[model samples]
Target: GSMDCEVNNGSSLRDECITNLLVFGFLQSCSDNSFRRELDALGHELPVLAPQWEGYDELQTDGNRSSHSRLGRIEADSESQEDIIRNIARHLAQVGDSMDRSIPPGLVNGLALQLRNTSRSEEDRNRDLATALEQLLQAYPRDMEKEKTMLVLALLLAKKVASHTPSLLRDVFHTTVNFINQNLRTYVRSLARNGMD
Candidate 1:
């Protein structure tokens, strides 16, 4: 059913999975295993930060949880996965600390709909979402490290899609992220076929 949004449906969390896939594919094609060793050896020690965006409190923030909220309210699940992913992305952006590396605001924000909270004009803020998607066809997973992370990413997406209704994906991302965030990276490194350990 169209209404039955779940992990496999490619909703909220889809972007992360797709992004990781594209990145992975690109890495493999480029034969970049050196970066993997750096990423693997880094021994991340940063705090797990929650996601924050511009003028969050100023607006109602509402009961909505979907990143795609402009389209409408999406369901959330156990974990609040969007918060987790956004936090991870922010962490990456911060550790790497370059505005140049940030998710394009338009890409991240996607296309806002004509709704009550719509702040930006639809005309100027319009993005070529499909064009970006087409460009992504060339990317692939980096390795097992990226593969497992993408799996977690997929779970995040599944929740997001299921959430197309707030809170549904949130709950799921929350539950899984807690466990995965704590152990997934480690296990990936330890068991990673590509020497993720």
Candidate 2:
């Protein structure tokens, strides 16, 4: 099905739309309560980040319209978007770099190889990706129980698509399983620990 969101609210199907092409459908299934944990698993977590993501309209437009394109690379147009991109990138790179300092060159080369494989223009892959991620983050509101539930189902559907590669050459990611584990353990635990759940 096509993904069509209202001006202020994105579609429930949009969540599944995210994972349709991704190897990890769990990321697509992120409910408001679970999104933070999902991001944490990716090495980036923010309990409340809906505002930041919705602001990146351009990236969303392009990414939604073009499924094959990597929306993560959209460049920042202002300080807010820039700061988000910088913080996320710097943090992830730092975490990865710290994990394996000798891999920067490999990462760089890997990036080149990936770019060659991708169909989108390299005009601003980094910015586009940042914008898209920011947009998704912003989709979760501070108080969104109903929204979270829809997201959960949407993500579940996405996981269905992601768990099977359907081809030998394709990739399959069990991020859904990972998400369920993280949500039950980390996310729920965090809530109980904080007396917020």
Candidate 3:
């Protein structure tokens, strides 16, 4: 069984660890491409992302210490570990905010699968996925493929974001239109090809 990343309080898990796990798992999964769409799906595409994820697993679990020089330096620093983690979180947020848009819509769905795959223990995996999904929906929600829409609906349901009113969700839709307008032809052609496949 996997271990709990959060510390147990008198009654529940630590709140700070909860937030950290949500953001950490989401960011970790976002940068990974280990899995794509459903095994039975037609187009299981992976998006081209520029940002790379920090491989902390080696630092935490390496016996011979083969691949964690940076983690060692970070751990030896005078700064608190939480501060380092928070700084890392901000950088991942920046990458997701400024990533390129010319991507396959199936890649969005692939990201969703990766999000689900990152949970080693129960730190509210759906909550982490919801955060990543919301960020992706806000950052690049244009010309979404069929699978992307399915993932969005599933995420919104998990987070109860689907219950919001039109007045609240209108901006999301408007921004998505702007995203599509920037590369209308490319997105359209891609969608056409994906449909045929």
Find the candidate with the highest TM-score and give its number: 3
Output the number of the lDDT-best candidate: 3
Q: Which has the better lDDT: candidate 1, or candidate 2?
A: 2
Q: Model 1, 1-197: lDDT tens per residue?
A: 56566646544422223233222222221222433443222223212323434554576645656555334233323146443433334233233223323434433122212111133222221122222222343275454444354433332222222222121222222222323333343332221122111
Q: How high is the lDDT of residue 49 in model 3? A: 28
* TM-score on alpha carbons, each prediction: 0.21, 0.20, 0.21
**What is the lDDT for 26 in model 3?**
26
Candidate 3 per-residue lDDT over residues 1-197, each given as its tens digit: 55566954455322233232223322322333332232112112221222334454546543665665685556446376455544544344334434422334445434334333434212233344445545656666657453345343432232121112111122222122222223332332222222211
Order of the predicted models by lDDT, top scorer first: 3, 2, 1
Q: Which prediction has more favorable lDDT, 1 or 3?
A: 3
- Candidate 2: segments with Cα more than 4 A from true spot: 1-134, 144-157, 160-165, 168-173, 184-197
Between prediction 2 and prediction 3, which has the larger lDDT? 3
Q: Over the stretch 1-197, how does candidate 2's per-residue lDDT look in tens digits? A: 45555546645422222122222222222121333344335423212223255654556444456355536554343245333433343333234323332333434333233222344312232233233334555675546442234323322232222222121111112222223332332332221122121
